[model samples]
Target: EEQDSLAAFSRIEANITQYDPLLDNAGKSACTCICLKAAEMLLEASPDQVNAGLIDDILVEGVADYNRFKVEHTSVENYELNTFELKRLEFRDVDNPFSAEGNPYAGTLDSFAKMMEKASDSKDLPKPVALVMTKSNMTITIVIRPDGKYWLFDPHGTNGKGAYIESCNTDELIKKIKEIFPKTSYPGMTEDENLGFNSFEAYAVRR
Candidate 1:
């Protein structure tokens, strides 16, 4: 978990520039943006999303051309810039959906069962979802379908760049999380035992 990823990084100051995760060259951690982008992809691929005049081509690198399903670049950019250095930037100009002080885990997922539930909670089938797991510092987007298959997008992951495909097994995921969360790590920042999975502040974006 202490692997803040992208071996191309040093510190926030002194020498850093030209970082963007849409292409996976980010200078800063882009967990939030990637998480939301993954959610948009799920919505765009849901049943009837295409036949409904949503997309007929690959006009964008994002989810769909339906406008609604696309996660804008500026949204990702602004959020990153605003969050890079804590109070270095605030929410003054950013249009955020969730905030730590107010809505973190209200309709989110904390376990495997809950994750699968949310992924299938949509109105129709083909089973896409609006859920993504977020925690102490990074964001993990998961799409656990009704068929019990699951996939994740961890932009900072060590292998496969960012995409991870796996089964919807509870025990395996639990073991994974324990290895990911603190044992107290991240030299740049430490996991607050009071706020992370230890006490369950993990969340998923709800629909």
Candidate 2:
């Protein structure tokens, strides 16, 4: 199993581009960046390929659209904000779009998932999947292998490394994330009868 994990990780690392954010200040948009990069890689690998120009255009427009949404909806009034601040506004909202059905990009998970679906030709490639580490306010995009292990790509940072891939079972990977951010009272850390750290969410491409 150890050898197989290493092999899978290596394969994913070789195939995808590593996008380490030049400025660490944009961690609020980490989820968005990660999902976009993953979708780019998946589509780039498609046999029925689209031109890079189209891909680049879609991504640029998506970012602009997201920024606009933050400006229109963010509750932080009369305060100067950075890009990460603008990006993280939705997470603080009680009616965030993840649990609702209005705008697709209103929530980080849905936004990236929607972007992947739009970018894909759908006939030739499966749409990418987005997973949220709700406890830490972190997100990652994933590609599942035929063997059931997931190719987890983190664009922000992973285990102190730059953008990279980690191969693991879905449940196991979630547990690892729990260990990374053990503090309570975050997005996924709701109290329950069981009282355990088992809260996270996953979104798949909309059909």
Candidate 3:
């Protein structure tokens, strides 16, 4: 019986090796940057309205989800997989999107652009929105189209967590999001009870 079990296990292992899910390393990196960039944009675009509490919520929900998707489906190759730690860095960068010297606005603009640049330059990192637009003949869809577009690609897509800047009108956008995520009525709150809204205790730990 033991011999038969061993043979069966070996057979299963052999079959598993026959199949490979060689993941898209570049695309995975690009996707990670896309989510992070968008999240950072959202917070920078709305500082007073979106506090640390709200920012953290969005990071874990949208940014963390994107990270998790990569971890499960792709290999890191040369990039780090410390999502939580990255969150810490992101939080700081977003909060201080400028240097102490020079015009505040100019500093912020430069800093934000730098973040995008860093993400774009990372080795093995995926081609981001701009690169995707330039490198491939593909027409990138970061903005939502008509019919209540909600994606950066869709603007009104179902998965969209659309945003608004101080210059633009966000009342309508906020209302639309409220309808989509009714219970929370906001984009940055943790949608899952298991994650524990407004609590760092719910996030995962790495050793």
Candidate 4:
């Protein structure tokens, strides 16, 4: 019995370590995905007018910082909280921008400001006037508006309990968005900045 207990405890400890690092790595990947996708979208939208690769690099740095702090301070075992619950806690006030309940979303707003400032200062993005964050589990999957400000939505908040939020990597979310809104003309079902040059032939013809 003593040996069995020891072995089980060892296994639990090993699993804990693995889980912690795994979560961190996943979070980091998520940040990269978000930044990359945003860059890709901006590139396609602006065509050669924007340098997608450079924008991706700038956003990646911010994402790294965000996810590192999120993992270090908000991981499951570290806080004895559900991994999913972190999303709700992190996204608080995403919907009601003016109410006291909505003020906390400002942190995310500040982050967006930093991202936009970097992109604009570097001349990567066109002074991104807005950002939208969506989640699958929420009553309103989309939150964020760009009226020189931000807003959150829970379209079907018929029941007060229906409003819930969670954390997700922007990269992963972009993939899902593409799946929902497939790109037909662009390679890999993604948008290209220069619609005239979505293909090599298009570029050659233009040249």
lDDT per model vs. reference: 0.37, 0.38, 0.26, 0.26
Per-residue lDDT tens digits for candidate 2, residues 67-165, read 444432122222122322222112222245335542223323223334333323234334333332322345555554444555555544443434455
Model 3 alpha-carbon drift over 4 Å, by segment: 1-33, 37-170, 184-207
Q: Quick one: best lDDT, which candidate?
A: 2
Model 2 residue 37 CA deviation in Å: 2.2
The per-residue C-alpha lDDT of model 2 at residue 50 equals 24
TM-score, per-candidate, Cα-based: 0.44, 0.42, 0.21, 0.24
Pull out the clashing pairs in model 4: 33-171, 34-171, 44-192, 44-193, 47-193, 87-166, 87-167, 95-152
TM-score of 1: 0.44
State candidate 3's TM-score. Answer: 0.21
RMSD of 2: 11.0
User: How do the residues 1-207 of candidate 4 rate in per-residue lDDT, one tens digit apiece?
Assistant: 122221122111111221333334444324322322332233233222223232333234424544544532221212211221111222222343443642223222113333323322432222322232322211112222122211111122122221112222344433433443233354564333333222110000000
List, in order, the clash count of every candidate structure: 0, 0, 18, 8
**Top-TM-score structure, candidate number:** 1
Instruction: Estimate, for each residue in 1-207, the C-alpha lDDT of model 1 and write its tens digit.
Output: 232211222111101111223334431244555455545554445322322111111112221222332342322334422222211111110122444543433322234345344335434324444344545556565555544545444444443223332333445555565555534334564334323433333333323
